[PDB]
Amino acid sequence: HTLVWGVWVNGVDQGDGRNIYIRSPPNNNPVKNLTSPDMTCNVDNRVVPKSVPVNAGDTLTFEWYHNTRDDDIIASSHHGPIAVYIAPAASNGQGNVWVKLFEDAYNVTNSTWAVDRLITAHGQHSVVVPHVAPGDYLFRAEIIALHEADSLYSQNPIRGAQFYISCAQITINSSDDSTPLPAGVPFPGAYTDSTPGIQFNIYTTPATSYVAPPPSVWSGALGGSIAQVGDASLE
């Protein structure tokens, strides 16, 4: 159970974005039905009044929290990967539009899941804004908690992979468009019961064998991190 509080741009806090520039759901419960319309941008996908201005090459940091800002972030049980996707905003996240900018699943070097590192990072993970066409975008940050993913939700709706999905409205102002955004995948639709990384038993299957759900990270993506970029406690 986790939500996005807001974003930072080049280490500058853009302030509380909930229901303002984040398409916030009413609560931190997960989405679990892979064919749900809720897979796009969680259960309350609608235009919110603001979009955060960025330029190509800016560091864009998502900040998650559990109950209050800069708390436990997400229950430690919720091991799993983190991904960020981008789609043009006029799509409203519909159709073949979502392009993956970031993936971090299990780090063999550190012996930690992305979620484990997200907690240590006070809920902060970042991407480099890509060199796409100037305009309005949705950045879809997705945490998959795998602690009940040994079952398919479609088998047993009390369990399944858990999707914590948050869509931020971002406006890309200055961009040379050196990497035009291609068509991408649909949500719902990209993940199915047979997709690698959706059904996974973390109790019996080593995390060294985990394969995150496709799609692969786009060739235009410039990278990211899971690391504290801003200190919320200084405000």
Ligand X SMILES: OC[C@H]1O[C@@H](O[C@H]2[C@H](O)[C@@H](O)[C@H](O)O[C@@H]2CO)[C@H](O)[C@@H](O)[C@@H]1O
Ligand Y SMILES: OC[C@H]1O[C@@H](O[C@H]2[C@H](O)[C@@H](O)[C@H](O[C@H]3[C@H](O)[C@@H](O)[C@H](O)O[C@@H]3CO)O[C@@H]2CO)[C@H](O)[C@@H](O)[C@@H]1O
Residues engaged in binding ligand X (CB under 6 A):
103-106, 212, 216-217, 221
Q: Rule CB under 5 A: say whether 1 interacts with Cu ion.
A: yes
Residues 55, 48, 33: CA angle, nearest 5 degrees? 100
Q: Is 78 annotated as a binding residue?
A: yes
Measured between alpha carbons, how far is 73 from 70 in angstroms, rounded to an integer? 7
Q: Is 23 annotated as a binding residue?
A: no
Q: Which is nearer to ligand X, 43 or 207 (CB)?
A: 207
Find the binder of ligand Y among 35, 77, 110, 178 (CB under 6 A): 77
Measured between alpha carbons, how far is 30 from 156 in angstroms, rounded to an integer? 15
Residue type, 53: P
CB 70 within 8 A of CB 120: no
Closest residue by beta carbon to Cl ion: 166
Measured between alpha carbons, how far is 125 from 118 in angstroms, rounded to an integer? 7
Residue type, 153: Y
Q: Which is nearer to Cl ion, 14 or 166 (CB)?
A: 166
Q: Is 147 annotated as a binding residue?
A: yes
Q: Rule CB under 6 A: say whether 1 interacts with ligand Y.
A: yes
Q: Cis peptide leading into 188, omega within 30 of 0? A: yes
Smallest separation, CB 119 to ligand X (Å): 17
Q: Rule CB under 5 A: say whether 159 interacts with Cu ion.
A: no
Name the percent of the chain in helix, strand, coil, to the closest 5: 10, 30, 60
Footprint of ligand Y (CB under 6 A): 1, 28, 66-67, 75, 77, 147
Site of interaction with Cl ion (CB under 5 A): 3, 25, 42, 166
Binding-site residues for Cu(2+), in ranges, read 1, 78, 164
Q: Interface with Cu ion by CB under 5 A: which residues? A: 1
